[PDB]
Design a protein around this ligand. Structure first.
Ligand SMILES: CC(C)=CCC/C(C)=C/CC/C(C)=C/CC/C(C)=C/CC/C(C)=C\CC/C(C)=C/CC/C(C)=C\CC/C(C)=C/CC/C(C)=C/CC/C(C)=C/CC/C(C)=C/COP(=O)(O)O
Ligand SMILES: CCCCCCCC/C=C\CCCCCCCCOC(=O)[C@H](O)CO
Ligand SMILES: CCCCCCCC/C=C\CCCCCCCCOC(=O)[C@H](O)CO
Ligand SMILES: CCCCCCCC/C=C\CCCCCCCCOC(=O)[C@H](O)CO
Ligand SMILES: CCCCCCCC/C=C\CCCCCCCCOC(=O)[C@H](O)CO
Ligand SMILES: CCCCCCCC/C=C\CCCCCCCCOC(=O)[C@H](O)CO
Ligand SMILES: [Cl-]
Ligand SMILES: [Cl-]
Length: 541
C-alpha cells in the first residue's frame, strides 16, 4: 500500500549516503590520521600495536581501525573506504534506533525517528566524516536501543537475556572503540534513571554475570595483548587519555556544546520543548531513559576540561527517538508551524551565505571560501525547496510532509558538506601527491621537518620520519627513538652526507633551512614544501 514511495525514498537516501563518501578529499587531522593508521595496520598485518607514521599511537583503541582495515581488504584504498566505518555506523544508529522506537512507540513513531536522525546534520554529516565519534555513537546507539529492547514487558525472558547480552557486548565494543567512556556513560545514565524513577529492581533485569562476562571476553583480549607487547600502554592510555583529559586542561566554556546541540539538531529545534514533554509520557520508562541519556551525556561533556564537537554525537540517537515521539503527536497545523519557522530559519541561512566569503582559516586563501559560499547558498536553497514541497504535501498528511522535509534537509546539509571540498582539496595536499610519487620510492625517507602532515602520507602511501617536534607522536618518538630524528641538526647531517630522501616542511621551515641547508624543491603547496637532497628528484632551479 503506497510502499513504493518508501522504497524509493530509502533508495534516494542510500545512494546519496554512499556516493557522498567519495565526493571529496580527506581533511585533516582526523580523517587522514585514522585513514593512515588503518592503512599501516592493513599493510603490516599487526592488528594489536596501533602505529601512526611508523611510531606508536596509544591514544585510541582499535575497533574503528579494524573496521576500516576490513574495508581496505574488501575495497582497496581510498576515501569512501576510509569513511565506510562511520557510514555503516550511521546506518546502524538509524536502523537500531528505529527498531527500539517501533518496539516501544509504534511503527509511525519509528518512521519519524528515521526521518529525524536522517535530517539531523550532526548525524548525517558526522556519519560521512572519518572520526571515531560516529562509530562510538552508533555502537552506543546499539547499547541504548538494546537496553530498550530487553526491558520490554511483552518480551520473553529469553528475549530479555538476548538483548541484554547484546547490550553488554555492545558497550564492550564501545569501550573497544573509544575507551572507558562506553561503559562509564551508560552506567551513569542508568544511575540517574534509577535515581529519578526509584526503580532499583531494574538492576536485577540486567544479567550482570553473563553480561559482564560477555563484555570481558571481547574487551580484555586486545588490552592484554597490547599491554604485554607494550608495557607502557596501560599507564598512558588509562591515565593520560582519560583522567588527565577529563579533569585537566581543547578547552572551552560550560556552554560549549549548547549551540553544537541546537546546531546538530537544527531542523527539529522547533520541537525541542516537545521532546521534553515526551519524557513525561513514555513500569519501565523508555522516553525518560532517552532523555536521561541525552541530558546525562550532555552534562558529562559540558563540564569536561577537554572538549571537541564530536563528543556529544552519541546523544543524537536518543534525541532522535524522542523526536519520533514528538512528531507522532503533532496535528497538521502543528507541523505547519514547523515548516513556516524552519522556512524562515533556512531563509536567514540563505541571506547569511556571503559571510563565508570573508573567512580565511588554516592559512587557506579567501578564494576557496568564496567558492564555498556558493555551495552553502545552494544548500540552503535545497532546504527551502524541501520545505516548500513539504508544505505542498502537508494536505496529504503529516508523515509525508515530514518525509519530504527531512529529505530536503538531508540533501541540503549533504550539499553543504560536499561544498567543503573546495577548502579541503588544497589543504589535503592530494594535488602534489602525483608530482611527488613520480620520484619517491618506498625505501626513501620522507622527513617531516617539524610538521606532522596527516593527509599527505596517506595519498603518498608512505609514512613520515618525524624531525624535531613530533607533536602527538612525541610519546611514540620517545619510546622508539631509532625511528625519529630528535633535533634539526641531526636532520641536517642526515641530509648532507646521508641517504637520498625527501622532506615535507612548512614554508617558514623552508625559509629557515634555506640559508644553511641546500635543498631543491620537489613540490610546493599552500602549506607544504617538499624537497629532496639530490638534485635529480626535482626539476628546474
Ligand atoms: C541504561 C542503558 C541505556 C544501558 C544499560 C547500561 C548498563 C548495563 C550499565 C551497567 C554497567 C555498570 C555496572 C555501571 C556502574 C555505574 C558506573 C558509572 C560505573 C563506571 C564504569 C566502571 C565500572 C569503570 C570506569 C572507571 C571510571 C572513572 C568511570 C567514570 C565514572 C563517571 C560516569 C563519571 C566520573 C567523572 C570522571 C572524572 C570520569 C573520568 C574517567 C572518564 C570516563 C573520562 C572520559 C572523559 C573524555 C573526555 C572522554 C573522551 C574520549 C577520548 C579518548 C577523546 C579523545 O579526543 P580526540 O582524540 O582529540 O578526538
Ligand atoms: C531475541 C533477541 C535477539 C537479539 C540479537 C541481537 C544481536 C546484536 C549483537 C550485538 C553486537 C554489537 C555490535 C555493535
Ligand atoms: C502534572 C503536573 C506538572 C507540574 C510541572 C512541574 C515541573 C517540575 C519538573 C521536576 C523534574 C524532577 C526530576 C527529578
Ligand atoms: C534478585 C533480585 C532482587 C532485587 C531486590 C531489590 C531491592 C530494592 C532495595 C532498594 C535499595 C535502594 C538503593
Ligand atoms: C558528571 C556529572 C553528571 C551529572 C548528571 C545530571 C543528570 C540530570 C538528568 C535530568 C533528568 C530529568 C528527568 C525528568 C523527570 C520527569 C518525571 C516525570
Ligand atoms: C495552500 C498550500 C500553500 C503551499 C505554499 C507553497 C509555496 C511555494 C512558492 C514557491 C516560491 C519559489 C520562489 C523562487 C524564487 C527564485
Ligand atoms: Cl506547536
Ligand atoms: Cl571536505
Amino acid at each position: 500500500a503506497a510502499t513504493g514511495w518508501v522504497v524509493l525514498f530509502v533508495a534516494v537516501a542510500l545512494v546519496v549516503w554512499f556516493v557522498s563518501l567519495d565526493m571529496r578529499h580527506l581533511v585533516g587531522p582526523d580523517e587522514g590520521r585514522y585513514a593512515e593508521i588503518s592503512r599501516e595496520m592493513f599493510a603490516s598485518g599487526d592488528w594489536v600495536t596501533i602505529r601512526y607514521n611508523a611510531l606508536k599511537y596509544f591514544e585510541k583503541p582499535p575497533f574503528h581501525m579494524w573496521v576500516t582495515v576490513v574495508g581496505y581488504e574488501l575495497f582497496g584504498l581510498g576515501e569512501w573506504q576510509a569513511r565506510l566505518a562511520v557510514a555503516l555506523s550511521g546506518l546502524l544508529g538509524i536502523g537500531v534506533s528505529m527498531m527500539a522506537a517501533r518496539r516501544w512507540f509504534g511503527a509511525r513513531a519509528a518512521a519519524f525517528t528515521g526521518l529525524a536522525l536522517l535530517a539531523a546534520p550532526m548525524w548525517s554529516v558526522a556519519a560521512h566524516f572519518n572520526t571515531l565519534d560516529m562509530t562510538l555513537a552508533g555502537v552506543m546507539s546499539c547499547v541504548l536501543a538494546f537496553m530498550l529492547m530487553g526491558q520490554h514487558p511483552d518480551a520473553s525472558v529469553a528475549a530479555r537475556r538476548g538483548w541484554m547480552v547484546a547490550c553488554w557486548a555492545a558497550m564492550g565494543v564501545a569501550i573497544l572503540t573509544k575507551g572507558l567512556v562506553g561503559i562509564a556513560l551508560p552506567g551513569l545514565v542508568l544511575v540517574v534513571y534509577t535515581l529519578v524513577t526509584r526503580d532499583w529492581g531494574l538492576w536485577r533485569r540486567l544479567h550482570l554475570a553473563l553480561g559482564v562476562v560477555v563484555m570481558l571476553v571481547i574487551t580484555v583480549p586486545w588490552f592484554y595483548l597490547v599491554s604485554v607487547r607494550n608495557p607502557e600502554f596501560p599507564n598512558f592510555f588509562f591515565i593520560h587519555e582519560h583522567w588527565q583529559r577529563y579533569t585537566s586542561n581543547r578547552s572551552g566554556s560550560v556552554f560549549y556544546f549548547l549551540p553544537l546541540v541546537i546546531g546538530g539538531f537544527l531542523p527539529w529545534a522547533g520541537i525541542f520543548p516537545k521532546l521534553w514533554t515526551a519524557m513525561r509520557a513514555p513500569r519501565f520508562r523508555p522516553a525518560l531513559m532517552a532523555g536521561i541519556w541525552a541530558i546525562a551525556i550532555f552534562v558529562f561533556f559540558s563540564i569536561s576540561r577537554s572538549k571537541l564537537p564530536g563528543y556529544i554525537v552519541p546523544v543524537i540517537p536518543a534525541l532522535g527517538i524522542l523526536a519520533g515521539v514528538a512528531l507522532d503527536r503533532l496535528s497538521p497545523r502543528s507541523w505547519g508551524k514547523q515548516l513556516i519557522g524552519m522556512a524562515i530559519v533556512a531563509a536567514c541561512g540563505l541571506l547569511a551565505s556571503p559571510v563565508v566569503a570573508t573567512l580565511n582559516a588554516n592559512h587557506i586563501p579567501n578564494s576557496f571560501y568564496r567558492a564555498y559560499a556558493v555551495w552553502v547558498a545552494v544548500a540552503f536553497v535545497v532546504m527551502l525547496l524541501g520545505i516548500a514541497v513539504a508544505r505542498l504535501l502537508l494536505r496529504r498528511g503529516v508523515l509525508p510532509s515530514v518525509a519530504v522535509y527531512a529529505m530536503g534537509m538531508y540533501l541540503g546539509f549533504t550539499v553543504a558538506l560536499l561544498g567543503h571540498e573546495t577548502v579541503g582539496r588544497p589543504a589535503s595536499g592530494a594535488d602534489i601527491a602525483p608530482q611527488i610519487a613520480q620520484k619517491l620510492t618506498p625505501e626513501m625517507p620522507l622527513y617531516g621537518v617539524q610538521m606532522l602532515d596527516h593527509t599527505l602520507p596517506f595519498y603518498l602511501r608512505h609514512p613520515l620520519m618525524m624531525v624535531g617536534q613530533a607533536d602527538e607522536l612525541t610519546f611514540g618518538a620517545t619510546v622508539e627513538p631509532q625511528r625519529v630524528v630528535p633535533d634539526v641538526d641531526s636532520f641536517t647531517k642526515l641530509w648532507k652526507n646521508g641517504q637520498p630522501a625527501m622532506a615535507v616542511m612548512s614554508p617558514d621551515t623552508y625559509l629557515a633551512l634555506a640559508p644553511t641547508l641546500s635543498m631543491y624543491v620537489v613540490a610546493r603547496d599552500w602549506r607544504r614544501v617538499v624537497v629532496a637532497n639530490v638534485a635529480s628528484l626535482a626539476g628546474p632551479q
